[PDB]
Curated annotation (Swiss-Prot):
There is a cross-link at K68 (Glycyl lysine isopeptide (Lys-Gly) (interchain with G-Cter in SUMO2)). Zn(2+) binds at D170, H172, D258. It catalyses: N(6)-acetyl-L-lysyl-[histone] + H2O = L-lysyl-[histone] + acetate; N(6)-acetyl-L-lysyl-[protein] + H2O = L-lysyl-[protein] + acetate; N(6)-(2E)-butenoyl-L-lysyl-[protein] + H2O = (2E)-2-butenoate + L-lysyl-[protein]; N(6)-(2-hydroxyisobutanoyl)-L-lysyl-[protein] + H2O = 2-hydroxy-2-methylpropanoate + L-lysyl-[protein]. Keywords: Acetylation, Biological rhythms, Chromatin regulator, Cytoplasm, Hydrolase, Isopeptide bond, Nucleus, Phosphoprotein, Repressor, S-nitrosylation, Transcription, Transcription regulation, Ubl conjugation. The keyword Repressor applies. The active site is at H135. Residues 2-315 are annotated as: Histone deacetylase. It comes from Homo sapiens. The modification N6-acetyllysine is found at K68, K214. It is found in: Nucleus; Cytoplasm. This is Histone deacetylase 2. Ca(2+) 1 binds at D168, D170, H172, S191, F192. 1D-myo-inositol 1,4,5,6-tetrakisphosphate binds at G21, K25, R264. Widely expressed; lower levels in brain and lung.
Amino acid sequence: GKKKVCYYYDGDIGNYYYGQGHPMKPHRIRMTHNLLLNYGLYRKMEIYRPHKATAEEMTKYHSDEYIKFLRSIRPDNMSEYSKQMQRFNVGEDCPVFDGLFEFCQLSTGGSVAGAVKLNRQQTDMAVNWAGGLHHAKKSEASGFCYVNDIVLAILELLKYHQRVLYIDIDIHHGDGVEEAFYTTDRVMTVSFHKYGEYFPGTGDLRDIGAGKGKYYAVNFPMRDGIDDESYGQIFKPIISKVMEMYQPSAVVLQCGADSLSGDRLGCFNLTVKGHAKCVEVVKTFNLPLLMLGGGGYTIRNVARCWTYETAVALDCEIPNELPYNDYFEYFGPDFKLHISPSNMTNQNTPEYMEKIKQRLFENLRMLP
Ligand SMILES: CCC(O)(O)CCCCC[C@@H]1NC(=O)[C@H]2CCN2CCCCCOc2ccccc2-c2cnc1[nH]2
Ligand SMILES: [Ca+2]
Ligand SMILES: [Ca+2]
Ligand SMILES: [Zn+2]
């Protein structure tokens, strides 16, 4: 039936600024929070302020040198770190900004605290919209991500769970998470993403893991314009087959909203209902679930998406008419929660979708 939901948020998160022109806007986390508060979604959730994750907690995955660099670099001392900035990929995608380390600490803190709460069996679902920064590598920042909160949260879940399933619906391939667990069978990574002339360039359907991890990495490459009907047609059957064969005891779901129609960086055509259908599908398996944020660059749509997905987690129906809120003007001209898909062509033909699904099913037959 209905589940206990714990939600992680720090009121300072929305103040971190990547810089003029950078599409990553932490303010979208504050817009999501304000919208869900105005819908009354706080009445049924336990709301927690995450602790600032320590450099030591971060080094359970990242190298000591990389975390030391992140804790030391600032816009005023950048000139003395030109060498380390190149080595750690800090530059245009991953700039140095005021409070960078504290932003990482809050993003990570929410994910790890949620994983601890799930491990203690004190909640059925834990939500951290500030997390889901899937591109960060052991000693390298990548694609707007500096610390891989997902990998750290999964390592925490692995203390009490033999098998953990990671599912990523961000439009970009979840490369940092896949790479971290590529050679183990204790984590199965499943990523649905745009593939072909698109960042990060990885996630081919032939990338299936290595060594003990062979068959434990699953990639569903897609083309521009995927819609609710097409996405829905493959998501449930793939996730159902993965649940059946892998039998995970905990799940982490990265809910990157850049797979929505009208995204500034994405080229998919999902609606908020289509995107949220993934949360409904995963929730139906009744396993401990950590829901995380990720991409999303048309910020009014990110707020709508994550507000609706929090309502889905709580099994609460919310009206389409948006309640008045601190950012009401951002939701014009309609002031509605749900969005309409565009007229963009869906390059993913029904035959292509079935063919890729059948190839993934062949790989899933190889599990013990
Ligand atoms: C949070 C999780 C996530 O949503 O998955 C992160 C997605 C990360 C995408 C990284 C990718 N980066 C690139 O294509 C890099 C490699 C060559 N370019 C150069 C960097 C350009 C400047 C910074 O970037 C932008 C600035 C303005 C507008 C768009 C971009 C941009 C678009 N795509 C990129 N960057
Ligand atoms: Ca993905
Ligand atoms: Ca794996
Ligand atoms: Zn993305």
